[PDB]
Amino acid sequence: DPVQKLFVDKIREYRTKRQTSGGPVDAGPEYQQDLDRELFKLKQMYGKADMNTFPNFTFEDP
Amino acid sequence: IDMEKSQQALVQKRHYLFDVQRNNIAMALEVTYRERLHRVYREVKNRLDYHISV
């Protein structure tokens, strides 16, 4: 198991990715552009309510 | 005599209209309560789902 040089090579590039992930490394503008795109899509699909605490209802009796 | 006696025996039970109204208004109150509970549950679930899905 200590022999599959590709195995340990992938694990090593993994460890490097782990340490370097202070901010999404090699993100490029596509990272932010996408993140924004699907965040906006999800926000639109879900709702526009006070996305922080519980909005209040204040119903009306019959 | 029979007409009058049966008329009285019948108008004795005119209370069904009010009994209706009673249970109908109780039903209206119950449906309002159910809608309130389900609306609050739906809103909380919607916010939780928003967070989880993002």
Curated annotation (Swiss-Prot), chain A:
The keyword Phosphoprotein applies. Belongs to the eukaryotic ATPase subunit F6 family. This is ATP synthase peripheral stalk subunit F6, mitochondrial. Keywords: Acetylation, CF(0), Hydrogen ion transport, Ion transport, Membrane, Mitochondrion, Mitochondrion inner membrane, Phosphoprotein, Transit peptide, Transport. GO terms for biological process: proton motive force-driven ATP synthesis. GO terms for cellular component: mitochondrial inner membrane; mitochondrion; proton-transporting ATP synthase complex. Subunit F6, of the mitochondrial membrane ATP synthase complex (F(1)F(0) ATP synthase or Complex V) that produces ATP from ADP in the presence of a proton gradient across the membrane which is generated by electron transport complexes of the respiratory chain. ATP synthase complex consist of a soluble F(1) head domain - the catalytic core - and a membrane F(1) domain - the membrane proton channel. These two domains are linked by a central stalk rotating inside the F(1) region and a stationary peripheral stalk. It comes from the Eukaryota. It is found in: Mitochondrion; Mitochondrion inner membrane. The modification N6-acetyllysine is found at K5, K10, K43, K48.
Swiss-Prot record, chain B:
It is found in: Mitochondrion; Mitochondrion inner membrane. The modification N6-acetyllysine is found at K5, K13. Coiled coil: none annotated. It comes from the Eukaryota. Belongs to the eukaryotic ATPase B chain family. Subunit b, of the mitochondrial membrane ATP synthase complex (F(1)F(0) ATP synthase or Complex V) that produces ATP from ADP in the presence of a proton gradient across the membrane which is generated by electron transport complexes of the respiratory chain. ATP synthase complex consist of a soluble F(1) head domain - the catalytic core - and a membrane F(1) domain - the membrane proton channel. These two domains are linked by a central stalk rotating inside the F(1) region and a stationary peripheral stalk. Component of the ATP synthase complex composed at least of ATP5F1A/subunit alpha, ATP5F1B/subunit beta, ATP5MC1/subunit c (homooctomer), MT-ATP6/subunit a, MT-ATP8/subunit 8, ATP5ME/subunit e, ATP5MF/subunit f, ATP5MG/subunit g, ATP5MK/subunit k, ATP5MJ/subunit j, ATP5F1C/subunit gamma, ATP5F1D/subunit delta, ATP5F1E/subunit epsilon, ATP5PF/subunit F6, ATP5PB/subunit b, ATP5PD/subunit d, ATP5PO/subunit OSCP. This is ATP synthase peripheral stalk subunit b, mitochondrial. It comes from Bos taurus (Bovine). The chain holds residues 150 to 203 of 256 of the full protein.
